[PDB]
Design an enzyme around this catalytic site. Sequence first.
Site, PDB file in Angstrom:
ATOM      1  CD  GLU B 207      -2.986  -0.995   2.217  1.00  6.37           C
ATOM      2  OE1 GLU B 207      -2.983  -0.298   3.093  1.00  6.37           O
ATOM      3  OE2 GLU B 207      -3.969  -1.700   2.013  1.00  6.37           O
ATOM      4  CD  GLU B 372      -3.693  -5.941   3.789  1.00 10.78           C
ATOM      5  OE1 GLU B 372      -4.721  -5.209   4.185  1.00 10.78           O
ATOM      6  OE2 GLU B 372      -2.295  -5.682   4.203  1.00 10.78           O
TER       7      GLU B 372
END
Lengths: 471, 471, 471, 471
Positions: B207, B372
């Site tokens: 991220e 995720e």
Amino acid sequence: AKFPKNFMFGYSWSGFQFEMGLPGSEVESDWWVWVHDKENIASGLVSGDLPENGPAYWHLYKQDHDIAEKLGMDCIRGGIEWARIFPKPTFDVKVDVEKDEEGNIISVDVPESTIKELEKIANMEALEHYRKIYSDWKERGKTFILNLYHWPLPLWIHDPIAVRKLGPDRAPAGWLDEKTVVEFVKFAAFVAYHLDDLVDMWSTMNEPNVVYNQGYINLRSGFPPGYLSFEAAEKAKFNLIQAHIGAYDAIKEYSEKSVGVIYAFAWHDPLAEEYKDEVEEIRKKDYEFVTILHSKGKLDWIGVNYYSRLVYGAKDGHLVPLPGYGFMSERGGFAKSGRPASDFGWEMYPEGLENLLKYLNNAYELPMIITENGMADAADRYRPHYLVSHLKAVYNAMKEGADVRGYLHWSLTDNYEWAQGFRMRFGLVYVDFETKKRYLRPSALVFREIATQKEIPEELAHLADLKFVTR
Amino acid sequence: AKFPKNFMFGYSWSGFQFEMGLPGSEVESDWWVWVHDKENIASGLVSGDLPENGPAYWHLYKQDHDIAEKLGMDCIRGGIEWARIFPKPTFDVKVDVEKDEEGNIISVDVPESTIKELEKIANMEALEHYRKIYSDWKERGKTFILNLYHWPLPLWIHDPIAVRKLGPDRAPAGWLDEKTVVEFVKFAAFVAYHLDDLVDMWSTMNEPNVVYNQGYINLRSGFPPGYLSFEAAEKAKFNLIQAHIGAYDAIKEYSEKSVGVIYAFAWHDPLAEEYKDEVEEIRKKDYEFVTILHSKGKLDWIGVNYYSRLVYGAKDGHLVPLPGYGFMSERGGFAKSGRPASDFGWEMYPEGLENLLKYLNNAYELPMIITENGMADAADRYRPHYLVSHLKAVYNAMKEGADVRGYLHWSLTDNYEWAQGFRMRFGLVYVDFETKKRYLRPSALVFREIATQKEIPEELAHLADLKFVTR
Amino acid sequence: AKFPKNFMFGYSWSGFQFEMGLPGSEVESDWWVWVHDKENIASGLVSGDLPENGPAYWHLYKQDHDIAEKLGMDCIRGGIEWARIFPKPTFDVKVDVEKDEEGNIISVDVPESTIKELEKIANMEALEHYRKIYSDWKERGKTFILNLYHWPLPLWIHDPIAVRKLGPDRAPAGWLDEKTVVEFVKFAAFVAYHLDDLVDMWSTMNEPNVVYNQGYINLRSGFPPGYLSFEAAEKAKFNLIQAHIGAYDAIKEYSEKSVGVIYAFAWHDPLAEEYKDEVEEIRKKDYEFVTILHSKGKLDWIGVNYYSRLVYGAKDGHLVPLPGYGFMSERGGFAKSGRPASDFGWEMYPEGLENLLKYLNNAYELPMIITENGMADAADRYRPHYLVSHLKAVYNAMKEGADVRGYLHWSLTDNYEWAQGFRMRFGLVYVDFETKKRYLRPSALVFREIATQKEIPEELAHLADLKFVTR
Amino acid sequence: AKFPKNFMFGYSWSGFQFEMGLPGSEVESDWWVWVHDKENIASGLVSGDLPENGPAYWHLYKQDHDIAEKLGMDCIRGGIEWARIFPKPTFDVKVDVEKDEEGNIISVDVPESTIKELEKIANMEALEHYRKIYSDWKERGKTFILNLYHWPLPLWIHDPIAVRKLGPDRAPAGWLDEKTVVEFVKFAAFVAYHLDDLVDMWSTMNEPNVVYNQGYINLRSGFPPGYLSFEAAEKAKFNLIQAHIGAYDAIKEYSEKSVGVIYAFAWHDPLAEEYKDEVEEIRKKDYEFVTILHSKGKLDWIGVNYYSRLVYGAKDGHLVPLPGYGFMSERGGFAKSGRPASDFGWEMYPEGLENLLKYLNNAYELPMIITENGMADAADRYRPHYLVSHLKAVYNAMKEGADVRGYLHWSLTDNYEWAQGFRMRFGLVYVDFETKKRYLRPSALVFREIATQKEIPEELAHLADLKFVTR
């Protein structure tokens, strides 16, 4: 509930929130830049609403005073914008500020010839328009209270974008620079020199506790400069103390009228009996700024700005202000107590105002005016009960000894609520910001009836009872 | 709904959120400092919860893997903390990183002799302990993905507090200093050189988009360094792109295995058809980091992190993400769509994931892994539906051409959720952070049955249906 | 928490709520008529949902039994519908029922030849089908408990549409008629005569207190005959007391097994200390039905149906059950205690069960089975905690002297919830009522773990703790 | 918005809800017995609040008229209680009512002699007292509208407890008996004969559609006699139609004035355009009572009672009134439209009033008066918007051709709201039911300002805009 014959009713305004709205009135300042800043907008720290779409009081003051006078108002506390009067640097023009070895202002002297040097560079046309505004109200036989400072600063005094990008030491830093205080003293004496004939009482400043706590520690408030530092909060607090003391000295040089401060007073409550002692201590430290001023012999009256409370309980751990009470309630909903909260999420809690005035009276034995009290409430759902309940709270504090001289609502009209923009509507009078048209809210009719008769008449007494508004 | 017989099931973790909890595990970094800072705590930007009170994976990994293996998990994606491996500066060990005149890394050499110089200054014991962790898992016969970066940086690379106080030109400034990329490249080479035997696939970073937008723009998020600057956001993004390319080249030097990135992919929806094209453009812009990487041939697989969506409509009249949908829903409540939202306020929206995967498949045509997917849900009120329905969405995307190799839930256990501390619980397994004991949540039993048959069986299929959970 | 080796796990069903759903299983009864009535529907008194679209257990019992067995259940409490067995009147078949001067039944006699007169009138097909269903569970080596009455009556005993239209004195008036007791006695004998080889324990009736209270006083409930009258409530209660006494003696004439009743026990709580004595009294009055039976020596065990509590506080004092608590909570929301409420608005309160069990142990000193415990929860949001926290409660009460022999959840599958229709979903297993497919809810997997192991294992122990579910 | 110089402003009252409160005023009626019944009370069908604790207008009318006149009201619609005037049966006093073959009243004649016969069993003192009340208003030079029937029937006409317990063929059955219509005719003629000199217009009855729908179908409303039957609803409706015709014929014998009815008009909305036509049929069915009266030429004017709307959507195969809109909204909260709802759960929907008036104008072409319009709002949160927006709705409807002669608010003061008791507070004036003191709500101020100028002035025009009140 009869008030004394000389009890004043009316309202309060600030320059930044009310003046702007029509071409001709735009002025630069730290807050103007803060609120037009694209990054502040995009990060959602300010609303994106702009004060030059505001209520245009700089142009429509005569019309707004007509409203105020017709609601039976006889007192207004107004503002004067340092950023307007001195849009260029004053540093070059010297004055005598005397300090003790710990740096408290001990005396000041702005002589008349130095005043005369400031005129050469002040915007004298702005100063004249302020006279017009203030005259327009004084001429009707009414009282005017003037507050010298209501947050924005000249851009040459404070560049909040640069303090934030660069650090306070690489930019003009406002209350963090010892010199701002001196410059403010110049400003205070220069206003007191030209304007004493129009002013009944002085305030040096408005809510300084908000300026330092929100600018330097409570960052999600979206206050300039949003520079997170305990040490800075403390500096700023120390320098506002001096700004007050210096302004007080500067004013008394050219006026014999009373000089106080206007301060934000939350009322602190403990969730239960076991925290009484701790809450008492949070209270001494939250009012500390004012205590300091009183002990220096530098307050003739105190303007109480009261809106709501804070409730304290244990979490873990530590003594914490609790969500769902007072200022931490759900916006436009209900506190955990069952009391409604404003559109701002502030619980309606008039008994805090009563407790506050008994506390302040015994604390300081000073003449007090309620200088702000009101609620964000666009639809006028709760403001009638807010108003009447808080007035009945002032009355009751008076029966137990408090010396209260008037009640000034926040505010006559909707206006620009700082980092929230226009969504927080605090007026007895709605303002369509596109057309600048004013409309009465029913609370204005209640206000008219109470102020004209100087009492809460029987037929309106029930609006102090909060039972039906509370779940 | 049967998955392919090699489709992996598993979970992800990061060093900072999991490793600590018990004595001996503590480690300094920019986040360590950020989350301990007194001013960040008072300003409410951080929870005041502390990572040393976490799940203690550093000590407790063996039982966690035992848990995972009996949930039927066969793949884990884990991390490795730069700040742990190199807690003293690597600046002095010269390397060869070649650049375009535009600043693009075009080649990397960290040769065997340099690796060995780096060993003298590395926490070689810290390294050995990571081998023991990955190895306890690899040895059970399972797959392990290593992600080199999951946000914290060594203090000597990033001093977030000094950046915020002083400005990033006067402190070590993380992703804003080009040099950090170069140090990151040394780190990547060091890891691939020593741990390739235990790693089936690499991710360079997790991220990056949250790293630069939360850190430099969305201040309410509470991310280091909390320094508002579009330029700084752009410069960090630029530099992260290089970090990815450099790290990719560096890994390929000591390894032939797949290398990708793990990215945060919000799904963007138009409130209505009139916003369709603008939203298509918001999506293009938001995924560009990945697109730049693919066009440069530096991605072998993509790690897809998906949790919710954002819905856009008009304001004044601006196009913005709308309160009450996706990431911006009521905490523990319902979105305006009727769907429930997590304890974090994230709308349950498994259709975003089915859409996302068609979109990515078509954009990039790469192998993908859900690296995720999960929900903050303390009570397991919703997580069972959250799981099966996102698993079914994955299944549909695959029926439509998406090359997806695996699903890794976020996460196996509750863990430290950055600025929010421990209040946000993502585990299939509840952790008592006082005792460090693990307890199953019923969604664990759901996972177990699904992963061990490599299918959503009939008897569990209604858990894909959100009807009964929607208002 | 380990249970004794012989502590029974299973579930309960009734005929009206479970049997129907597939062609061929429909029977007339007063409830059938009540829930089909067009005016009842138009007045919102009943939901409009028809029980012939229910789970179809009359056809599908064998599958429900496989599910049950595979969840580790070893006991089922089931029903037999009087309205199926005797669809035509049994008035003309004479029996010997002897009463007190106070109208208590003192002895009963249904001789063999009378049983054979009953056979000619009975629906013997339906009897035999009840045998196929019970045997299918018994042949597995499991326990079966048969409850003789679960609300619906033959139409020739009760026409609740004529009662309401004409008054109970002009229609067949159900429990308002002493003859209904006599005819119930014949039913009880006839069932004991035939079915004793298939039954391990008997219950004469299920929640009779709900029958008389809802039918004759709480109209908002939608219960037949919906005829408001305290005098009818009292008379219905009295005749159900005798129905149980008569049935016990009639069963004992043809069986040597334990005969009990099944009763709805709400737990009553004082909001504060000052109402404790008065709530104690509420509770004696509320349980008097069972008390009377114990003191006449007509109860071998007690079936405990527990779901929630009532909290009592002053309101014009005047002690009333307070909204926001127990059965009087917000549907799908949260009680004023912070506890979640079921789809039905019933506060999750396992502590009431622990209190109840000690209270009943002390009052009656009889063996007890939990014959119903469960929640309306279409999404399984809360059922996993409801289950584990209530089993923990049961175990605590046992640690403390309560003779509890087993736990029957309400229920295995979703079913027809009376006046509420299908919207209240109580199953561990969801039923699609269109297709009749059963699907497991994660609470089923939690049940299976506990029951097979005869214990709440550590790994699931935290499901007893309601902290994460409570606000 | 200027209203025509003769357009009337004022309010309405009914005897039952207003008269009683101080000793001397209590009268027996079906409603009196209904609301005192212990079983209706403990059943929660009625509030347990009692009318003899109400505002006591029977004694205090003069003070209430003073309030009214000072609010600038010039018109009052009031009631006369049949149960007061004729507390003993009038069956024996013969009269001439002529009918159709189809049972329609063709003519009526009550000769003077019979009037004298009726005087002799009437409570003439109660008649003189009503003369006092009306005359106190009339003497101020104001208009008074007398409405003959506002729900309570004399007990010898209707024993609702007995109708419910035994069925209407065995008790005095109110509108279920043909004979009640004949007795009402006698009452109509008698009142006309005596009182014409005090009355400017007549209404035969108020909201008959509520009497028969709530009494005989919608049992949840708690209205006497609580006897569920479609065919009783159709009977009562039929008799109520004849009652109007006969009262009209009786009144016309002794008066030259206008005679009409007051009807409850819900506005009916389709949720989406596809239901437009069905909803159109729903409208025409619901207003049939008034269509019938008009087609028989027995309406000189229509009294419009308007509060809110019902919105229609599909549920399974069929159209239902949808929860969360109109009359079916959340008490104290918001409808799904975002509009606020009253304390009765009624959506603020002025559009309905505008829509309805164009519909009625076009259907009937009759002078109309808004005879009830208002909201349960114990704290005046919303009444100032309610008032001003509905008045603007009227004004727009008049602009488009509706012949509307005035607006009467429900109501001047808080009063007893039937089964709800006092918790529904509809006054412009708050009444403390313990002390009987009256207090103005801010909406009374707004009303005063509007009625006295007979216009919605510019400064109050914004109260008609519901934007700030809606979410």
